[PDB]
Design a protein around this ligand. Structure first.
Ligand SMILES: Nc1ncnc2c1ncn2[C@@H]1O[C@H](CO)[C@@H](O)[C@H]1OP(=O)(O)O
Ligand SMILES: [Ca+2]
Length: 104
């Protein structure tokens, strides 16, 4: 069973923890990877019910289980705040354009 389901992608809590740790470290270091510069600021204009405060940052989570290293970021993202608290797991899959929907 999946702790988070993004479109057809299945993620366990461990996958999420791993991705967040990686993205957070980059953030602390003032570093980014990829053409789209991850991690990058995330604005909650869709009003997702996040239980932690902003600012928020988005970092790609890969279906493969590997940590994002600068290539295709896919559609899924982990969202974390300035304090390294998990805000949520979202995806571009099933949303129009560059918008998002929450993973279930
Ligand atoms: N797989 C994908 N599906 C839809 N939009 C995507 C995407 N990968 C990147 N984007 C969006 O494309 C634009 C330029 O790359 C950004 O708005 C980026 O949003 P993101 O960084 O929030 O994922
Ligand atoms: Ca996995």
């Amino acid at each position: 069973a999946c702790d988070y389901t993004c479109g057809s992608n299945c993620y366990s809590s461990s996958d999420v923890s791993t991705a967040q740790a990686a993205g957070y470290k980059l953030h602390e270091d003032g570093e980014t990877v990829g053409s789209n510069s991850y991690p990058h600021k995330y604005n909650n204009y869709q009003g997702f019910d996040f239980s932690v405060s902003s600012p928020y940052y988005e970092w790609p989570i890969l279906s493969s289980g590997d940590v994002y290293s600068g290539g295709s970021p896919g559609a899924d993202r982990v969202v974390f705040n300035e304090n390294n608290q998990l805000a949520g797991v979202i995806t571009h899959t099933g949303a129009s354009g560059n918008n998002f929907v929450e993973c279930t």
